């Protein structure tokens, strides 16, 4: 707190921030539980005020029902809220809130099998797909393609599109027999 | 043989991959003939028959050629997207996962959740040497290695990353000449990477768009075996056109409200079909002969039935439909039944669908006007008001279209990344490096040269 | 040309009526409203003939012996045997009438395919009689906003 | 209606600072001004923390400042919040 609200309030001082450079540990391991608030002080000054963030009071503001409570409160405020009570109506917000949140820590006291069918398929299906050429059946179309010609090399690579969609027309099929199998 | 065989094979998939969206218009063209020519189809006359009505007497060869025709065009469209669209597709998600690695250590200090079938698949990846296939930065792989070396282990990122670093040493050291070409087979099977082309494939097979495209292939294919197949291709239009694409949006823009609304529908007449089932049951009395008695709300499920399919539908409600109470002594408590579904079901329900669908409208109207105000009055890179700039004549227009171009940061992202790192100037060099560590402060933010250099300029 | 036609025929003279469009600014403003999102309300109508032509090829597909359009059980009258027939059918009655296509053609009761022509009924109401029109409407709503 | 209601609300708050009611532009003057400004500086988070360190807290070992604020609590004087005016607009010229 010390070190945070001397390099606020000095905020191009050298040899401030080589100290905090030293102070960079404890500043960011209290960073969380740091507040800052500007306050409308006695001298008709606008002054900081730093305290303490308590561990259980952060969580139970961010719980998702107290959220709720703040969207409500702040639609409320904005739509049929004047200036008149606006920080009256905050402050009561508040109060309820702080309520709510002493309550509920004190009451408070201390798709995986698709993902595995549907890797081995993509394995699987890979693996035979690449299956003739780790066989090197490819020794076959090999004297076909010595016949270097435009026709030739156009259904060969029609062929192995053709391969390519089968193979994807089993993966389809195996992902329906899946869900079937699934099902039933 | 091979460099001409290759180079032929790549003119024809860039030629792919150039019409890829002229055969995808003239595909729809195609469906829309065959559909033409299918408005004639007649059934003949147990024995089922199908003949088309040919006035022409070539009807049915045309429509064969058709089909046959469309089928090709499907098997290069298939080939099209891969050519064109899927490159695009795996160079995002390779550099999702790099800077994902890099930045968050997804791999080292955290690990999926599980749920996530993206990052489950992108585990494959990291161990191929073919990593930044496609993604720009080569340097990722020694850029996590800089980062997370010391802290689980050369040994371990090494391994997890699949680099030889044992093989650096003898590389730097002496290394004993080969013989290497490329004409073997066996060599150039070596160089393709089996578990890289496995994980292309995965998320090929992943993406949405190519899964759309494998279903009108099979759309077509069936309507090959059966005719009438080929009329679901009609449901292109909703991606052809984008000014249907418009009218779609505005009715799914609030999907989750209507379904939410038909479901409300649904519970709403089920209470009235329970209300009808206690009290109001020889009222649903639906036989036309009085010597044969139909009652559709003896049973539950078939007075809801009932309910739904005619009362829903019936403009005045379920009492236009069911008998008349005159004369009773439910009389009153009927005729309230009957106004209560009337208001509720038939006139609020109904009102609620169209009022959802008209919000949406209204909404989407709302936000291209937003979008287009905030353009014409903020420069998108400053966030400067226009009026600052239009105290000189066409300020604005020349701050935005001259000094702070989105198409000129983007043209200076690509001369940075097409240029040579050594020869990158000073300022080059100092945006590289944050472009590299993604620090986007060199983006000017609230003040510009006009700004910094108002009085000396003025 | 059509008051030199009127004196032959003197109904031709009702088109003179189309002149209210232009001889009143009032009137204008009501059809600037239609005409401002023409383009939408003609691809909506096309797109409500599209799904309209993918329900006929379902029912010619499926729902045949339910298109039974005759009063008298002697002679058939077949309304869905052809393509083009039960496409002019669909359109003609099912499109205009209020509660769809079922309210028209006959009843389901006792047949093996009752819950999906049920489906089918419900899934027209919905589709082409309530959401196409409430699409119509509501961009001429959104043309007057 | 009720979506011109959201919309209004999205945007005054996105415009307008909750407490400070200052526009969002001239905390923008500086990048990232104004969502520093509401959620470092102006956060009715910490404000709502600081009314619960207040409550929490014995009243003997209330500072200057936590006695002060503690008074007008008490007596329901909400002047002690900045309307209108903040730390950068006191500070301006020392700060920049
Ligand atoms: N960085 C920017 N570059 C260009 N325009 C900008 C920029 N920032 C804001 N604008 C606004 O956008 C207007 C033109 O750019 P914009 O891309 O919105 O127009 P367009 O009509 O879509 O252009 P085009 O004719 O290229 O399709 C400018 O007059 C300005 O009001
Ligand atoms: N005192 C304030 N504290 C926080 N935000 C404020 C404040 N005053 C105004 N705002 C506005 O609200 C924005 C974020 O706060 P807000 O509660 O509206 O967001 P949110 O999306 O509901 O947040 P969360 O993720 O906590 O649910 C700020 O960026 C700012 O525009
Ligand atoms: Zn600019
Ligand atoms: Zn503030």
New interface residues.
């Given amino acids: 707190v010390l070190l945070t609200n001397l390099s606020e309030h000095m905020?191009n001082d050298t040899r401030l921030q080589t100290f905090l450079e030293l102070a960079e540990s404890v500043l960011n391991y209290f960073q969380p539980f740091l507040?800052?608030?500007?306050?409308?002080?006695?001298a008709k000054?606008?002054?900081?005020?730093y305290?303490?963030?308590?561990e259980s009071?952060?969580t139970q503001?961010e719980k998702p029902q107290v959220k709720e409570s703040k969207r409500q409160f702040?639609?409320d405020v904005?739509?049929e809220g004047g200036e008149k009570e606006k920080?009256?109506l905050?402050?009561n917000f508040?109060?309820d809130?702080?309520f709510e949140?002493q309550l509920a820590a004190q009451i408070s006291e201390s798709?995986?099998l698709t993902?595995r069918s549907?890797?081995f398929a993509?394995?699987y299906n890979?693996l035979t797909?690449?299956r003739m050429?780790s066989l090197?059946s490819?020794k076959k179309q090999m004297k076909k393609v010595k016949k270097?010609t435009?026709k030739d090399?156009?259904t060969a690579?029609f062929s192995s599109?053709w391969s390519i969609?089968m193979t994807?027309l089993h993966?389809?099929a195996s992902v329906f027999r899946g869900f079937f199998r699934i099902i039933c | 043989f091979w460099k001409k065989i290759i180079a032929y094979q790549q003119k024809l998939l860039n030629y792919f991959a150039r019409n890829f969206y002229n055969m995808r218009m003239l595909a729809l063209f195609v469906a829309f003939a065959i559909n033409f020519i299918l408005l004639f189809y007649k059934v003949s006359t147990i024995a089922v028959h199908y003949v088309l009505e040919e006035s022409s007497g070539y009807m049915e060869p045309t429509l064969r050629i058709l089909a046959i025709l469309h089928t090709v065009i499907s098997f290069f469209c298939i080939i099209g997207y891969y050519c064109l669209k899927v490159p695009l597709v795996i160079f995002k998600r390779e550099k999702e996962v790099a800077r994902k690695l890099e930045f968050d250590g997804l791999y080292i200090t955290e690990q999926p959740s599980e749920d996530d079938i993206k990052g489950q698949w992108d585990r494959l990846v990291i161990n191929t040497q073919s990593f930044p296939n496609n993604y720009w930065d080569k340097f990722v792989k020694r850029k996590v290695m800089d980062k997370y070396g010391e802290f689980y282990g050369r040994d371990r990122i090494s391994e997890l990353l699949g680099m030889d670093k044992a093989a650096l040493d003898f590389s730097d050291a002496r290394e004993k000449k080969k013989p290497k070409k490329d004409s073997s087979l066996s060599a150039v099977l070596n160089s393709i990477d089996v578990k890289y082309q496995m994980w292309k494939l995965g998320v090929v097979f992943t993406d949405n768009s190519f899964l759309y495209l494998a279903w009108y292939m099979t759309m077509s294919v069936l309507g090959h075996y059966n005719n009438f197949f080929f009329a679901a291709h009609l449901l292109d239009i909703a991606m052809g056109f984008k000014t249907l694409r418009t009218i779609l949006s505005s009715v799914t823009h609030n999907g989750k409200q209507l379904v939410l609304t038909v479901g409300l529908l649904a519970v709403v007449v089920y209470l009235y079909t329970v209300v009808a089932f206690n009290f109001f049951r020889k009222f649903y009395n639906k036989s036309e002969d009085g010597d044969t008695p139909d009652m559709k709300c003896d049973d539950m499920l078939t007075c809801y039935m009932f309910h739904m399919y005619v009362g829903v539908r019936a403009g005045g409600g379920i009492g236009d439909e069911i008998e008349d109470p005159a004369g009773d002594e439910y009389e009153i408590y009927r005729i309230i039944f009957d106004i209560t579904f009337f208001f509720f079901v038939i006139v609020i329900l109904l009102a609620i669908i169209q009022g959802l669908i008209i919000d949406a409208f209204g909404e989407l109207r709302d936000q291209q006007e937003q979008v287009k105000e905030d353009m014409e009055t903020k420069c998108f890179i400053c966030g400067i008001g226009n009026d600052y700039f239009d105290t000189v004549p066409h300020g604005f227009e020349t701050h935005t279209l001259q000094e702070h171009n989105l198409a000129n940061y983007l043209f200076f992202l690509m001369y940075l990344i097409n240029k040579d790192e050594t020869e990158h100037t000073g300022q080059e060099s100092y945006v590289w490096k944050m472009y590299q560590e993604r620090c986007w402060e060199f983006f000017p933010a609230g003040d510009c040269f006009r700004k910094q250099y108002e009085d000396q300029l003025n």
């Avoid at chain 1, 507040?35 to 002080?41: A, D, K, N, Q, V």
């Avoid at chain 1, 305290?51 to 308590?54: L, P, R, V």
Wanted: one cysteine or more.
């Fill in positions: 905020p507040g800052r608030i500007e306050i409308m002080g006695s000054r606008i002054e900081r005020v305290f303490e963030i308590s009071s952060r503001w702040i639609f904005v739509n920080m009256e905050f402050v508040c109060e809130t702080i949140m798709s995986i993902v549907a890797l993509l394995r890979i797909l690449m050429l090197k490819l270097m435009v090399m156009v690579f599109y969609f994807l993966f389809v």
